Amino acid sequence: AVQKSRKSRSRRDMRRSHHHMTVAELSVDATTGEKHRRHHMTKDGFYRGRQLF
Amino acid sequence: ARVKRGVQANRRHKKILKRAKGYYGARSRVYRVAVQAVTKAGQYAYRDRRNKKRTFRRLWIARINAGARLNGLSYSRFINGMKKANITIDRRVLADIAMHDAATFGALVEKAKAEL
Amino acid sequence: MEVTAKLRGAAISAQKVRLVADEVRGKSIERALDILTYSNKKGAVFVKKCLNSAIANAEHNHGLDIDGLKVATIYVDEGITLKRILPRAKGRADRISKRTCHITIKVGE
RNA sequence: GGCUCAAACUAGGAGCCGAAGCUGCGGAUUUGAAACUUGUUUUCAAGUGGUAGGGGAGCGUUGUGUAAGCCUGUGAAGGUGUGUCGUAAGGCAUGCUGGAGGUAUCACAAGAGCGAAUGCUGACGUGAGUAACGAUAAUGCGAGUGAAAAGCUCGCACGCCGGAAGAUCAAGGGUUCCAGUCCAACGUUAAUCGGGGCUGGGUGAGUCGACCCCUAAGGCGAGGCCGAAAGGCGUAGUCG
RNA sequence: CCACUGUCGUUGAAAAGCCAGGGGAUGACUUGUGGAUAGGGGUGAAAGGCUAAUCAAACUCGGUGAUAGCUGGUUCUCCC
RNA sequence: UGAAAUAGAACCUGAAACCGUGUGCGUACAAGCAGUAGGAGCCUCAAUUUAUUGGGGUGACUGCGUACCUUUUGUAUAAU
RNA sequence: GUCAAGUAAUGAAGCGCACAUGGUGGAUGCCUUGGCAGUCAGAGGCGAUGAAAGACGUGACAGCCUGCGAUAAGCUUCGGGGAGGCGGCAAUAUCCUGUGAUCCGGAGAUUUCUGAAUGGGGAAACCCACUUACCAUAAGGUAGGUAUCUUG
């Protein structure tokens, strides 16, 4: 249930090693030329040269 | 006449933590662990100061045995031949000669074998 | 040459902000800004905000060309902790650390 | 491991290895013996593992005299490294930081030395970014505002209570009530929202309640009784 | 109003609860307000039960730095 | 501005625990109080008429090595 | 150059030690407005002319502290003093001041309510009164008196 001896800093960092932040993929819409997440529509709303609104 | 222990305690603890430089974990950072490691390190140094002479005699004997067997003789007979020839060269010098000068050690083995 | 921005006192744990910082350390400002604006972590708003402050400093106070800038070095430090009481079962109390962090970003060629 | 005319056993023989034992070299020290003789010098002899414990010799820190001295803004104390010296406690010098104090030598006095006492106070770790986010009555979408909206306002739809989860009080609390304004702290998340911060407003009685008149239990109680003192009881009365 | 059974909970939503069942429910009943009984004392359809989350002698202060042939700790150095 | 702003109001100094970033070396075939006695390689400063020594950082590999205190006849003790 | 055998170096998801540079934190050093123990003197009480301790108010200015008491950071008088001042956090505004202000010392006046509280009561800062004199004509105001005990 509890430790018998306090974990060391190196041992604690070894578990943390795997944790990593996800980095989103980036594509530029040809019509609007703005950065946007892959397979996700742009801020403006232009997706694959189509008007959502 | 009150005495504050801060400055003297700081310097006392810094001495131990300085002697504990290079140690792992708490041993080089926190005093309760560092002080034991420093005392135990002193104990190991004290014991290995005795043990180093034995280890180096061991190494010299091994090298002298190797040289004597290259020249056709064993260590227990080569040293006996030295002692019968009244040659006082120590094992440290004998090992140095065996390692770095083969012909002189061959001459020494010849003298030992002539004395045997 | 290194222009600095500091964001002392963020209401977030340094351990959480460090994951964001590790991904923008050493990158160009454009790539770092892209990562931070498409990041899914709360630390990313603070890191982007400090990086933007640093870029503005380098462009206004020192007249640098931001086109050639880079995230020269970034690290997160622990700030002051707000100590709060958490009631538990059977009338027992626990202390709560609402941690803060200081974000330091330096940009340069 | 592996070993069979052995690397087993028996009886011998010769070599070597083998300890902090002995010897060799250098140094320190206790006692004793000799002499320049209170370390003034050199020697010799025997010693120098150590718990409880006894004896001897010192180190450092605070303060007093020495000291109206000496050092010190050409940088005191303190902090942090380095070099060097001594058997040790430790001393000395100096780079960096620091900004106003320190203290030589010898004496004198101690709140005079911390690693432990499930020791006390504060700070910070591991568990760990893990458990949990407090009734499984339920939310979906469109607008508004806003730096930002799953939670706020409005709208539509959905669901829950409905002898309550609706309304009026007493007790208790005391501004939590309404409006505007803000999101640092609080709200177990976000917050533009709030019983949160700040600034203003709001409580109108002959008939409601209190006060007031009356008294129950129970108190107190001119005189009175009792009791070492303090006080206890009690009549008329007065409160309740 | 009570608390007979079981699960859950046991660093709990809760320092005694929730859920499903259960008992009394016009009486030796339940409850609101005010008052009375005080520690070797009170009260007790009696369990040593209750007397402010404390009861084989409440709590606060004082005697008090109670006492403890017991446990723990007891801080710088070197020499014999 | 100030002499000084890592004297900027949580403000004289600013230690340690604890937590970051950077540079140098080592570490993914190897078992244990993590040190010590050796010791290759590498990096870095100084010399030196130029890879040889001296100082500093790391430590492949080999030998030895079961913490401290307390209490005990006796503790690495899995006794405190 | 092909094949075969043998054998180097290189790796770093992270980690370790050293150093450099930071964060946290508040030790250390220095400092004091505060305490402690004393010596030599003085004094040893305050109160029904209402005490100690309070509640509520009082400012140009919202809160607290300080002082003050409906004459409310205050008034009168008598001395000192001579240029600033309207107490502190804590400043601002209106102002005062050589016609002597602020400030200090002596005396006097005012001194709400509770509290021995003393007209009765009470859950302290509250309720209810009686009565003397005067004033008002309305549903009141001003100044008093009304506890108990002891001795005369």
PDB file of C-alpha atoms (C1' of nucleotides) in Angstrom, chain A residues 3 6-7 12 15-16, chain D residues 125-130:
ATOM      1  CA  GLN A   3       6.606   2.529  -0.057  1.00  0.00           C
ATOM      2  CA  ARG A   6      11.366   6.811  -0.589  1.00  0.00           C
ATOM      3  CA  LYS A   7      11.642   6.598  -4.361  1.00  0.00           C
ATOM      4  CA  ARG A  12      10.784   9.064 -10.502  1.00  0.00           C
ATOM      5  CA  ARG A  15       8.579   6.884 -15.169  1.00  0.00           C
ATOM      6  CA  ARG A  16       8.052  10.456 -16.380  1.00  0.00           C
TER       7      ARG A  16
ATOM      8  C1'   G D 125      10.236  16.030  -0.983  1.00  0.00           C
ATOM      9  C1'   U D 126       8.252  10.358  -2.161  1.00  0.00           C
ATOM     10  C1'   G D 127       3.484   8.249  -2.843  1.00  0.00           C
ATOM     11  C1'   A D 128       2.090  11.309  -7.794  1.00  0.00           C
ATOM     12  C1'   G D 129       0.311  14.205 -11.672  1.00  0.00           C
ATOM     13  C1'   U D 130      -1.896   8.652  -8.726  1.00  0.00           C
TER      14        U D 130
END
